[PDB]
Amino acid sequence: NSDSECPLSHDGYCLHDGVCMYIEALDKYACNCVVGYIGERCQYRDLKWWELR
């Protein structure tokens, strides 16, 4: 479904960008702020781009 529609809330649920995407009628939630904040719901490191990748 690519369900990431939670407008002002995607950036509200989280911190330094906030993005809500994983649900998919599975009630999932991956919250991916920015390459510099990712942990459970974006708050640890730049794992995504620099640290791990």
Do residues 19 and 11 make contact, with C-beta atoms less than 8 angstroms apart? yes
User: Method of determination?
Assistant: NMR
- Domains and their CATH numbers in the chain: 1-53 (2.10.25.10)
Distance CA 12, CA 36 (A): 17
According to DSSP, residue 22 is labeled: -
Q: Alpha helices of the chain — where are they, by DSSP H?
A: 7-10
Do residues 31 and 41 make contact, with C-beta atoms less than 8 angstroms apart? yes
